[PDB]
A paper describes a structure:
During the biogenesis of most eukaryotic integral membrane proteins (IMPs), transmembrane domains are inserted into the endoplasmic reticulum membrane by a dedicated insertase or the SEC61 translocon. The SRP-independent (SND) pathway is the least understood route into the membrane, despite catering for a broad range of IMP types. In this work, we describe a cryo-electron microscopy (cryo-EM) structure of a ribosome-associated SND3 translocon from the thermophilic fungus Chaetomium thermophilum. SND3 forms a complex with the biogenesis factors CCDC47, the SEC61 translocon and TRAPɑ beneath the ribosome tunnel exit.
We next analysed the structure of ribosome-bound ctSND3/CCDC47 by single-particle cryo-EM, resulting in a final reconstruction at an overall resolution of 2.2 Å. The map has density for a tRNA bound in the pe/E hybrid conformation as in the structure of the (TI)-POST-translational state20, however there is no clear density for a nascent chain in the ribosome exit tunnel. Notably, ctSEC61ɑ is present in a closed conformation. In addition, our structure reveals a further tight interaction interface mediated by two salt bridges between the second ctCCDC47 latch helix and the C-terminal half of ctSEC61ɑ within its cytosolic ribosome-binding domain. ctCCDC47, therefore, effectively braces both halves of ctSEC61ɑ, which would actively prevent the opening of the channel through rotation of the N-terminal half away from the ribosome-bound C-terminal half. Surprisingly, we further discovered that residues 64–91 of ctSEC61β (hereafter called the vestibule binding domain) are sandwiched between the ctCCDC47 latch helices and the entrance of the ctSEC61ɑ channel. Therefore, ctSEC61β and ctCCDC47 appear to act synergistically to keep the SEC61 translocon out of action, with the ctSEC61β vestibule binding domain similarly blocking nascent chain access to the ctSEC61ɑ channel and potentially providing a second brace to impede its opening. Like CCDC47 and the SEC61 translocon, ctSND3 interacts with the 60S ribosomal subunit, forming salt bridges with uL24. Namely, ctTRAPɑ has an N-terminal domain positioned beneath the SEC61 channel and interacts with the ctSEC61ɑ luminal hinge domain via its TMD. Interestingly, hydrophobicity analysis of ctSND3 further revealed a membrane-embedded hydrophilic groove within the cytosolic leaflet of the membrane formed by TMD2, TMD3 and TMD4. Strikingly, such a hydrophilic groove formed by three TMDs is a hallmark feature of the Oxa1 superfamily of membrane insertases, where it provides the route for IMP substrate insertion.
Numbering used by the authors:
A (entry chain LY): 1 to 134
B (entry chain LC): 54 to 313
C (entry chain LL): 2 to 210
Write the structure that this text describes.
RNA sequence: AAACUUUCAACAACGGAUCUCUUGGUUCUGGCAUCGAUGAAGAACGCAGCGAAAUGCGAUAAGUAAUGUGAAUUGCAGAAAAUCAUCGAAUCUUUGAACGCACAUUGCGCCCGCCGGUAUUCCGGCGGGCAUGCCUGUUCGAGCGUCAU
RNA sequence: GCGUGAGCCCGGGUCGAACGGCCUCUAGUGCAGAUCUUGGUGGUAGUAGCAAAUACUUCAAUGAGAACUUGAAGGACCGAAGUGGGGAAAGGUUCCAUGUGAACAGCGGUUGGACAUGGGUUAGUCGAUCCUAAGCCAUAGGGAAGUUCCGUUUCAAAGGGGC
RNA sequence: AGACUAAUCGAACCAUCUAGUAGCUGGUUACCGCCGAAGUUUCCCUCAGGAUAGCAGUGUCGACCUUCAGUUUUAUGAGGU
RNA sequence: CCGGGACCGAGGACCGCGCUCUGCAAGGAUGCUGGCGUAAUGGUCACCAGCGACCCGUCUUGAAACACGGACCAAGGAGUCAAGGUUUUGCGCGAGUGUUUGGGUGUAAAACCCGCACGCGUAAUGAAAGUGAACGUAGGUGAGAGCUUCGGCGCAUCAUCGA
RNA sequence: GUUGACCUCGGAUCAGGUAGGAGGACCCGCUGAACUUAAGCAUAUCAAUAAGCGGAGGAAAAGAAACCAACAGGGAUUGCCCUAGUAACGGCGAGUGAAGCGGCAACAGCUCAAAUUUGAAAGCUGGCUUCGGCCCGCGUUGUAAUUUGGAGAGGAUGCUUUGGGCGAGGCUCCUUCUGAGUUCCCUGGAACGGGACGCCACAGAGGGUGAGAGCCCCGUAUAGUUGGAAGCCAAGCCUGUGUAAAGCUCCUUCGACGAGUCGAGUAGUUUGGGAAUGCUGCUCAAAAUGGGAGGUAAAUUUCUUCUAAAGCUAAAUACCGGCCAGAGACCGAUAGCGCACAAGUAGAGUGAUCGAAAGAUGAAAAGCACUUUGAAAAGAGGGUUAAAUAGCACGUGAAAUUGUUGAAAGGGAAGCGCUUGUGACCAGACUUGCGCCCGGCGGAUCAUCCGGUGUUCUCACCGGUGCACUCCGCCGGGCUCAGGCCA
C-alpha cells in the first residue's frame, strides 16, 4: 500500500503517464530481465533493453526464439528481433513487435556506459542487502 | 457544475411557430441553432435540481450511542456462533476471545510479515487469512474506473496495546491481505462490525486484554449499559418451576382437529 | 401561505443566499495545517514556551462577574511591584498591557504573586555563553524539567469561588435585622428616592429664607 | 389461382440503441505567489527533406547554446543519438499598453555615425536614435517679482 | 417454467470480458403522451414536379457510354440603352496548361467557374503615395467619481533664415 | 404613413439581471392490497384563487366503560303548512 | 316412501356427536374395471367460427366525439436539496442533555479521546419597575386499569370544588 | 551702472529613473438597477445586489482606543461558535436585523507634528576618488540626535547594560541504489485463467505486458546509502570595551499633544440605530481639565471612560482565478465543461456576439498477394487472422423502416376478450422404486465377550474375538405395495 503523498494510485493518471511518457522515460519503462547466467555474473536483475542486445523470447507465440535486438521502437513500446518476422500478402517480410518484458536478455551489448550502469546497480543492490542484513 | 446547461443565450420562440415553447438556441449556420437549451428534458440542458455541495454528507452521532455500539460489537465478538454467521473461519481457533501472549508480538517479534504470518498460522487464523486471499474478485460496478477495483473478505483484526506491544506489529501485519490492526484504546466500530454485521474475528494480545477494562473505565460520561433483561435464556425462564407451577392447564394443542 | 397550526416562518432566504454559502469540508485539513504551524513555531522557540505569560483578570459584567480568566497582559504597576523592567518583560515571555489599570489591591497582589512565581521558575540563558552576566542562570541550574505551555502550567487555578463550605454551628452569622428581602426592598426604595428626598430637604432648609 | 395488402418466422438491409471500455470532465482537499516600457497578455505572418491543421518555434524559426541521461528517430528517406529530460546562456519577424508622425498606406519624416556614387546639402546601402505625464539633478534662460553695489 | 402482477429463471442463436444472489446503505432510480428534447425512419411516392428568356439539324472524330464534348456544314437569336469590348465596388485564383474514379453541374456528361498536379500578375511616365473638402483625432486648457467629454487655435513663453 | 432606422419598429439588435413572475394551459414514469371523498359553511378587491369548518386516510390510546342508535313504542311539549 | 338426472370429493393416523351397534350412509370418496403410455391428455402460435368489443391521455356535470395532443421508433425527460418549524416512529442518556467552535491523537478528510463556555430544559408573570409558586400524607368529590389482608389501595386520564 | 545673488516660471532627444496594459476567483472604494415579494401598488423588498468605473496583493483590508462598558471592571486588529432571528427597524405589512460580554484560533508592537544641537546641519542626493576624503547640490521657510502621553524633560542616586568572528552538530536541497517464479501440467492465437509446487512482503497502491500477474517490467515500503552544492538553525568556543550609549530607584518643578477640524443646523443617502447610525454637499464655526462618547429631544449639576482631526505593522481570515499535487459511495460519449477528437474549432452574423457534430478494427496491419469478369466502381475465387457477418461504410449491433424466402387470411378497416375446432410446433410425466420368499456369486462384520479412546456417563467408535440355522452387497425367479394419461 502506498503511503507517500507524492505517489498517486490513480488509474487515469498512471495510464496517461505511461502512454504519454517521453522517450527517456520509455527507455526505463522498456526494461528486460537478464538471464540466470548474466544475473549471477553481474548481480543485476533487470536493465533497460538496447539495440544490439541478444534476447530469447519467453512469452507469446514466438517462445524460445532467440536473436539480436535490431530496433527498439519506443513509439510503439516494442522491440524487433532478428528473424522473428512475418509475411504480408505480397510476401514481403516485416518484423514482429515484441514487448521487452516478454523476453530475457541472454547476451548484453557492453560499453563503458552500459557498464557504469551495471556497476551502479550492483553496488546499490549489495549495499541494500548489507543494510538489511545488519 | 453550477453553470452547466446555462452557458447559452437561448430564448423561447413563443407560440405561433408550430414548435414547443421550450427556449431555443438562436443564430444559424450550425446544428445547435434552434435546439432546446435549458430544460431538464433537453439534450445539453441543465439537469433537474442540480446536485449541490452543501448536501448533508456527514452524520452527527451521540458519543454515548457510539460507545454503546462499540461495546455491543465487542461483546458480539466473543460469541463463536456470531463469527461463523458473519463468515469467519474459526473452526480451528482454540478459544473465541482469542488471546495471544504479548511476548509474541511485542517489540520486533512480528515486525516482519513472514513472522506475523507464521504467528497467525500457529494461533489458528490461517484458514481465515487464506479465505481472504482466495476471495479476491474484480468489482462488478463502475467503481473499477473510480479506484475501487477489487473486493475481498475481511480477516482477523489484531488488537494490541501500543504502550506495551509497540507499533512494529503494525508494519508486520500491514501487507497480509484482509488483516488489519487497531490499538486497544482507539477501537473502531467500522472494523468491529463490518457492513453492520456483528461478530468480527479478533486476535487480542494479553496486554490489550489487560488494558481493556481501564480503557472503558477512563471514558468520561459513559458507563456500560444495563440491559432490559437479566436472563437471556428464554427456555430457562419459560420452563422453570416458578412459571410452570402457576400456569393453567393447556387449552389446546399445536394442531387443532377440525370439528365440523 | 399558512395552512395549519404552524409557527410563523421567518427563514431569511429571500436574498441570493446560495451565492454566499460557506461549507466546511476543509475542517480536518485546516486542523492539520494548524497543528503543523504549531509544531513549527514550537520548534523555532526551541527551549522557550510556545506562549506568553498572562495575568488573571475578572470578567466585566454583572453576568460573568463571578469568574476569572486570562487577560491580555500585565500592567506597569504589576511589573514594577514584581521588580521586572518594562523593556525586559516582553523579551522573557511576559505579556505587557499598558492600558489596563489596577483599581484593586486584590487583583494587583494576585498578579504580582503570579509574576514572582514566574520569575522564580525562569531560566535565563546568557546572551553569550563564554561570558555570562550576574542576571543569568549560571549554567548549573540550567538543566531542569521545563514546561512549553504556560497556558496550562500557569492557568486559572480556580475561575470560580468554591460553591460549598462548612462552618461549625454557633458560628452561623446573624441575619440582617429586618431580613434580607426587606433589606433589598429598603435599598431599592432609597435608590429610587435619593433625588426627591434631596430636593425636598434642600427646599425645606431654604424655606426659612 | 396469382398479384396486392396484412400477420407470423428465418436470413439479408437501414440505423446506431444496448453492453463493456475511457490519456476527458466535475467536485473536494493540500502546497505555492511568479505578468509587463529589460516591452506583457493578445493578434498577424512565416519556419520541417517530404505538412494543410494541431503542437512547437522566430530569418540562429518543428529550433541554437549549456547540463543530465546514455543509442535512437521512425510514415518514407537520410545520418552518425534523441520530436529525450532539465534548463541558469542566447536568438526572438510585423505588431500590440506600443513610443518619430501615421496606418483602410508594408505611407511620410528628422538626428548621429559609417560605406559608395565627384558631395555637410542630393541619391543608395548599413547601424544606432527621435512618444507622453511626472520626480531628482544638470545646464541654458525669462520676468522693474525682487536684493546690494 | 414460476408469479395475480410489476417481474424472475431456463433452452437455442449471436457475441466477446466482465457479472450476479442475499442483508444493510445510497440516489441524477422505473415513460406513450408534455404542438416534449436529440437522433433516426416511414406512408404520401417513383407522386408534385424538372413548361419565362423563339431552336435546333446532318456528317465525322473521341469515348464503355454523346441531345446538352469537339470539328465542319446548315438553320437561328442577341441586333450596338447588345447575349459585344473594357472598368469601379465585391470576390480571391474562379485565369492558363495537363489529367480525371467518386461527389457537384435538381437529365446525361468524354465536358466544367468541379476535382487533382503544375504554372501565371514585370511601371520614374497607369494608380496609390502628395494636396485639401465635408468630417475625424491630437495638443493648450476646461469639465467629469471615472470609462472619458468639450476643445482644433481656442485665457499657450507653441517657429525659421543667414554668416 | 407611427413611416424608416440591415427580411426586425406604437421604441432596433446583442449579452446579462434571468431558471424574471404567472390565482392560467400542458405534462408528471412499476405492480398488488386495504380504506375512500368533495363541489357545501364563514371570511377574503373573494367570483378560473385562498384560508376556515365539513367529508377522507393513517397512527395510536382508554376498562371497548356495558354502553351506543338517521328505528319503533309509550308519556309529554312546540309549530300555522 | 320409492325412482331418473346433473355439478362437486375440500380434509388427511386416532380423538367428537351418534345410530338401524361383531358394525355403520356417524366430524368432507372410496371400491372394481378397461384402453393408451404417447404428443393420446395438456400447452404455445396462426387462422376460421359464435358471441362480445368506439382511441388513448386530458380538462370536464358530461368524450368515441364534429374538443385539444399524438405519423413512427430509440435514448433523455419532471416533488430534489439546504436551513428553520411541527407531529408521529426507533434509539441513547435523563433533571439533565448535546464530543467533533476548538484542543489532543491518528494506520491521517476516518476512527478514538478532552474540556471551559454555550444552546435547549429545570419558573412563571407583567408594558415595565418588579415580584415569583405546599394549610392538607402535594387537598376533597365521582369514575377509573391493576393489586388487595377482600376491609380497600387506587396508575394514566376525564369531570368537578378548592389551595 | 552692469553684472552678481534669490524668488517664481520655463527650454533641452540634457543625466538617471518612474507610470500606463494584462489579470481582476478572492480584496479596497465609487456608481448603481429592474425583474421579484408584498397575492394589486407608490414606502418597503430584491439590494446597500447585478451591470458600469477606479486601485492592490499573495492575501488584501483592519489594527494598537477620542473603544467597550457601568462591572469585583475589561483592554490593538481579524476570524469561528454563541450572543440571536435577540435589542431594534418596518404601508409595525410583506419583511428586515446588529453589538457588548462569554469560549476558541492567532497574538506585536510601534513612529511622526507639537522643544534651541545652537559650544559649532552633527543630516541627505549626485560626481570624483584609493578608501583619506574631496566637490557640487538639498537643506535653517529645518535635514540628523532626543521625545510620542504607556509618558517624558530636567535634577539626584548607586547599581546594572552593549561590539565583532567562528562554529561542531542537526534540519534542508540535488544526485546513485533497492524483495521475490516467469518451475511443471490443461485450455487458449496469446495465461495474466484453472491445477500442482515454491518464494518475497516495513513492498498484496497503481499501471503495462497478446485474458483477473506481489515474485515478467516500471513503480510501490523503509529508513538508509553513493557523490555534490552549500540554503538555514545551532550547543559551545575565540576576541574587543565604556569616552559613548542604555535600563532601574527617588524627586520640588515643568510637562509642548494634530482647525474650515470637532461640534451645530439643514439636505440627500444609508443603517437595526428609533427628535436623526455612518457618509457627503452647503451654512455657521470651537475650546483648554478642554474635547468626544456614555443608543430619547432640552437646561442645570455630577460621574465614568478614553484622548480625534498625522503614520507603519506577521498571524489566525477570503479565494481552486493562476501554477503544481492528491483524492471521490460523482458522470460515463444525447452523460460529464460548449469542447474525451486539428473546440471556443468548423460554420452563421456588418457587428456586438452566436456556436456545433464528431471516441472504440485487431494482440499484432498481419489493412487481402495472385487468378478471373468488368470501361470503371466493383464482383467471383483465393489469401491474413482465433475470428472478416472484425475489411478503414471496421467491437457488440436493438427498434422504427425495407428486401427475399416460407406459411396464412382478405365481399367498404384492422387490432382485441371468452370459447371450441383445424394445422404447425412443443414442455412435462413414463420407461421404475419399495418390501417379502426361493436359488447363485462375492466379502468379512453379524451378535457376544476383552482392551483402548471419545462422549450427551450411557451411548458409541477403534483394535482383538467371531468364522456361517449370522451380516452386507450384486444377479436370477415368484409374490406384494405405490406409481402416468383418459375413461
Ligand atoms: Mg449536460
Ligand atoms: Mg433570482
Ligand atoms: Mg394476433
Ligand atoms: Mg448499418
Ligand atoms: Mg455506453
Ligand atoms: Mg518582443
Ligand atoms: Mg523611442
Ligand atoms: Mg522611449
Ligand atoms: Mg490615403
Ligand atoms: Mg526626402
Ligand atoms: Mg562619398
Ligand atoms: Mg544616407
Ligand atoms: Mg534607421
Ligand atoms: Mg546637462
Ligand atoms: Mg533674469
Ligand atoms: Mg477483448
Ligand atoms: Mg429522473
Ligand atoms: Mg418515448
Ligand atoms: Mg401518462
Ligand atoms: Mg424530430
Ligand atoms: Mg419526411
Ligand atoms: Mg409526373
Ligand atoms: Mg411549372
Ligand atoms: Mg418538358
Ligand atoms: Mg424556353
Ligand atoms: Mg468509336
Ligand atoms: Mg440544346
Ligand atoms: Mg426579338
Ligand atoms: Mg434578329
Ligand atoms: Mg450611350
Ligand atoms: Mg471580355
Ligand atoms: Mg462588360
Ligand atoms: Mg471603397
Ligand atoms: Mg478555365
Ligand atoms: Mg479535359
Ligand atoms: Mg445531374
Ligand atoms: Mg451522372
Ligand atoms: Mg465526369
Ligand atoms: Mg473517356
Ligand atoms: Mg479548384
Ligand atoms: Mg500619374
Ligand atoms: Mg510615395
Ligand atoms: Mg500636410
Ligand atoms: Mg476630442
Ligand atoms: Mg484638462
Ligand atoms: Mg394613425
Ligand atoms: Mg442587423
Ligand atoms: Mg426593415
Ligand atoms: Mg428603444
Ligand atoms: Mg435578447
Ligand atoms: Mg369500500
Ligand atoms: Mg378589502
Ligand atoms: Mg380550467
Ligand atoms: Mg295561515
Ligand atoms: Mg309562515
Ligand atoms: Mg388439445
Ligand atoms: Mg376471432
Ligand atoms: Mg357490438
Ligand atoms: Mg363544457
Ligand atoms: Mg376521452
Ligand atoms: Mg358531435
Ligand atoms: Mg375543452
Ligand atoms: Mg385547449
Ligand atoms: Mg395533430
Ligand atoms: Mg444514455
Ligand atoms: Mg427512457
Ligand atoms: Mg427538518
Ligand atoms: Mg448545560
Ligand atoms: Mg422577568
Ligand atoms: Mg375493579
Ligand atoms: Mg535623457
Ligand atoms: Mg520619460
Ligand atoms: Mg491598470
Ligand atoms: Mg406584486
Ligand atoms: Mg401575483
Ligand atoms: Mg404588476
Ligand atoms: Mg438596501
Ligand atoms: Mg460588479
Ligand atoms: Mg495568510
Ligand atoms: Mg496591509
Ligand atoms: Mg496610543
Ligand atoms: Mg477601564
Ligand atoms: Mg479587542
Ligand atoms: Mg429608519
Ligand atoms: Mg437590508
Ligand atoms: Mg474574547
Ligand atoms: Mg555618496
Ligand atoms: Mg524492483
Ligand atoms: Mg496449448
Ligand atoms: Mg489486463
Ligand atoms: Mg495459472
Ligand atoms: Mg500488475
Ligand atoms: Mg493626537
Ligand atoms: Mg465636519
Ligand atoms: Mg455627531
Ligand atoms: Mg452635515
Ligand atoms: Mg438627512
Ligand atoms: Mg448611493
Ligand atoms: Mg441620517
Ligand atoms: Mg443614557
Ligand atoms: Mg492619525
Ligand atoms: Mg492612530
Ligand atoms: Mg494601514
Ligand atoms: Mg458532450
Ligand atoms: Mg453518438
Ligand atoms: Mg455539446
Ligand atoms: Mg462570419
Ligand atoms: Mg463504434
Ligand atoms: Mg476465412
Ligand atoms: Mg457477427
Ligand atoms: Mg466481430
Ligand atoms: Mg459492427
Ligand atoms: Mg425490425
Ligand atoms: Mg371491428
Ligand atoms: Mg384451441
Ligand atoms: Mg469391534
Amino acid at each position: 500500500m502506498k503511503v507517500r503523498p507524492t505517489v498517486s494510485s490513480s488509474r487515469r493518471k498512471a495510464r496517461k503517464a505511461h502512454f504519454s511518457a517521453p522517450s527517456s522515460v520509455r527507455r526505463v519503462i522498456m526494461s528486460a530481465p537478464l538471464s540466470k547466467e548474466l544475473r549471477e555474473k553481474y548481480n543485476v536483475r533487470s536493465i533497460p533493453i538496447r539495440k544490439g542486445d541478444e534476447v530469447q523470447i519467453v512469452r507469446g507465440a514466438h517462445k524460445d526464439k532467440e536473436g539480436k535486438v535490431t530496433s527498439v521502437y519506443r513509439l510503439k513500446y516494442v522491440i524487433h528481433v532478428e528473424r522473428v518476422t512475418r509475411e504480408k500478402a505480397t510476401g514481403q517480410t516485416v518484423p514482429i513487435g515484441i514487448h521487452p518484458s516478454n523476453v530475457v536478455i541472454t547476451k548484453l551489448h557492453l560499453d563503458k556506459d552500459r557498464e557504469n550502469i551495471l556497476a551502479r546497480i550492483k553496488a546499490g543492490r549489495e549495499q541494500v542487502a548489507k543494510a538489511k542484513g545488519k | 457544475s453550477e453553470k452547466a446547461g446555462h452557458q447559452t443565450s437561448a430564448e423561447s420562440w413563443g407560440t405561433g411557430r408550430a414548435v414547443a415553447r421550450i427556449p431555443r438556441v438562436s443564430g444559424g449556420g450550425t446544428h445547435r441553432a434552434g435546439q432546446g437549451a435549458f430544460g431538464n428534458m433537453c439534450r445539453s440542458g441543465r439537469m433537474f435540481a442540480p446536485t449541490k455541495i452543501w448536501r448533508k454528507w456527514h452524520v452527527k452521532i451521540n458519543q454515548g450511542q457510539k460507545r454503546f455500539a462499540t461495546a455491543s460489537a465487542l461483546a458480539a465478538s466473543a460469541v463463536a456462533p456470531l463469527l461463523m454467521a458473519r463468515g469467519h473461519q474459526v473452526s480451528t481457533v482454540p478459544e473465541v476471545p482469542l488471546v495471544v501472549d504479548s511476548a509474541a508480538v511485542a517489540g520486533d517479534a512480528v515486525a516482519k510479515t513472514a513472522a506475523a504470518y507464521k504467528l497467525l498460522k500457529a494461533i489458528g487464523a490461517g484458514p481465515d487469512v487464506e479465505k481472504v486471499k482466495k476471495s479476491k474478485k474484480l468489482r462488478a460496478g463502475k467503481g473499477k474506473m473510480r479506484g475501487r477495483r477489487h473486493r475481498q473478505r475481511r480477516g482477523p483484526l489484531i488488537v494490541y496495546s501500543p504502550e506495551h506491544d509497540g507499533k512494529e506489529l503494525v508494519k508486520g501485519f500491514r501487507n497480509i491481505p484482509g488483516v488489519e490492526t487497531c490499538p486497544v484504546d482507539a477501537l473502531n466500530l467500522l472494523q468491529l462490525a463490518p457492513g453492520g454485521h456483528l461478530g468480527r474475528f479478533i486476535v487480542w494480545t494479553s496486554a490489550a486484554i489487560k488494558q481493556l477494562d481501564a480503557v472503558y473505565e477512563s471514558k468520561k460520561g459513559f458507563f456500560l449499559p444495563a440491559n432490559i433483561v437479566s436472563q437471556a435464556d428464554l427456555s430457562r425462564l419459560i420452563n422453570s418451576t416458578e412459571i410452570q407451577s402457576v400456569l393453567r392447564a393447556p387449552k389446546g394443542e399445536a394442531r387443532t382437529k377440525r370439528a365440523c | 401561505a399558512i395552512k395549519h397550526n404552524q409557527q410563523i416562518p421567518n427563514n431569511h432566504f429571500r436574498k441570493h443566499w446560495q451565492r454566499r454559502v460557506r461549507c466546511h469540508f476543509d475542517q480536518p485539513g485546516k486542523k492539520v495545517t494548524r497543528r503543523l504551524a504549531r509544531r513549527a513555531k514550537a520548534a523555532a522557540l526551541a527551549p522557550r514556551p510556545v506562549d506568553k505569560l498572562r495575568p488573571i483578570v475578572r470578567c466585566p459584567t454583572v453576568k460573568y462577574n463571578r469568574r476569572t480568566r486570562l487577560g491580555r497582559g500585565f500592567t506597569l504597576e504589576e511589573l514594577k511591584a514584581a521588580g521586572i523592567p518594562r523593556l525586559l518583560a516582553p523579551t522573557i515571555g511576559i505579556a505587557v498591557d499598558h492600558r489596563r489599570k489596577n483599581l484593586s489591591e486584590e487583583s494587583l497582589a494576585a498578579n504580582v504573586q503570579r509574576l514572582k512565581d514566574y520569575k522564580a521558575r525562569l531560566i535565563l540563558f546568557p546572551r553569550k555563553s563564554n561570558k555570562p552576566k550576574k542576571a543569568d542562570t549560571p549554567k548549573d541550574q540550567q538543566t531542569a524539567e521545563t514546561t512549553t505551555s504556560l497556558r496550562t502550567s500557569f492557568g486559572v487555578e480556580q475561575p470560580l469561588a468554591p460553591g460549598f463550605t462548612e462552618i461549625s454551628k454557633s458560628e452561623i452569622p446573624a441575619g440582617i435585622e429586618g431580613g434580607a428581602y426587606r433589606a433589598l426592598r429598603k435599598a431599592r426604595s432609597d435608590a429610587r428616592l435619593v433625588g426627591v428626598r434631596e430636593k425636598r430637604a434642600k427646599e425645606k432648609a431654604e424655606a426659612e429664607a
